[PDB]
């Protein structure tokens, strides 16, 4: 299996999610619309990024490795949308949204910058991202969880489930960064890409399907 084949699989998986989220949302009132639209943006952006890589664009040589710019650009655009979706469920205000989106953006910017740095100092950038990520996790399991606990049962339950998916799975990405091409390159480029396709699909499309399943249930009682 070649890299471009894996990228095409990523694009198709994301498209399938996008179509599912769009159509599920056709049944949505003023209160639910923004959630469905957010899911469409998340998987739609990812679908296009995967197409870009599958078409052989954005493969950046860095020293003796290859870094995929569209991967990191996707994350910069889509992870704050996931954080936004979570913050909506939690019932955050603008100031709270600003904090978590900022922490999120620092992680993705640092990780992208580090991947693009040839020298050993790329690990300093990783480190900056890792600290910001611990801050984001704190916000997710602390303050945001406290905010979510004030909302309805169905909403609190969805928040916790999506929060758990997000915290556990997002924590795997930095290990793939460290062990893969940007770090010590113990994972082959193929295994690196395959792991990220699966992980992206679960954190975006799996996340969305969990939300779709909960939304149908709340509306049907």
């Amino acid at each position: 299996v070649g890299l471009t084949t894996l990228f095409w699989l990523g694009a198709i998986g994301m498209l399938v999610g996008t179509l599912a989220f769009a159509w599920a949302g056709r049944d949505a009132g003023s209160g639910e619309r923004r959630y469905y639209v957010t899911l469409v943006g998340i998987s739609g952006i990812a679908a296009v990024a995967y197409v870009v890589m599958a078409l052989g664009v954005g493969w950046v040589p860095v020293a003796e490795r290859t870094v995929f710019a569209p991967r990191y650009i996707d994350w910069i655009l889509t992870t704050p949308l996931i954080v936004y979706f979570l913050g909506l469920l939690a019932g955050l205000d603008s100031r709270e949204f600003g904090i978590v989106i900022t922490l999120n953006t620092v992680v993705m910017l640092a990780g992208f910058a580090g991947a693009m740095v040839p020298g050993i100092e790329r690990y300093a950038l990783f480190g900056m991202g890792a600290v910001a990520f611990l801050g984001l996790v704190y916000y997710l399991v602390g303050p945001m969880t406290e905010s979510a606990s004030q909302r309805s049962s169905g909403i609190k339950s969805l928040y916790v489930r999506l929060r758990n998916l997000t915290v556990i799975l997002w924590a795997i990405y930095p290990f793939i960064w460290l062990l893969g091409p940007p770090g010590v390159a113990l994972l082959t480029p193929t295994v690196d890409v395959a792991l990220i396709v699966y992980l992206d699909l679960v954190t975006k499309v799996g996340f969305g399907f969990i939300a779709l399943d909960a939304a149908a249930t709340l509306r049907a009682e």
């Binding site: 299996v1 916790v160 489930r161 758990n164 998916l165 556990i168 799975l169 795997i172 290990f175 793939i176 062990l179 113990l186 994972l187 082959t188 193929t190 295994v191 395959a194 792991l195 699966y198 992980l199 679960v202 799996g206 969990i210």
Partner: protein
């Protein structure tokens, strides 16, 4: 949970197939060190994959 499990079970064999293909391709080379390289990647990758699957499962069938 069912659709979740066969999704997990099927993607694991599909990942194992990719890893196996990498090892066989390296084997076709005749270079032992190349095979070790593909194998170390496959082992690390499969360990990470457990983490992902376990993470997904714990997150969906937990509370």
């Amino acid at each position: 949970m069912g659709a979740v499990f066969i999704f997990v079970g099927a993607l694991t064999v599909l990942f194992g197939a990719i890893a196996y293909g990498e090892v066989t391709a390296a084997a076709a080379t005749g270079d032992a060190a190349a095979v070790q390289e593909a194998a170390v990647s496959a082992i690390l990758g499969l360990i990470i994959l457990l983490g992902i699957n376990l993470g997904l499962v714990a997150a969906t069938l937990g509370g």
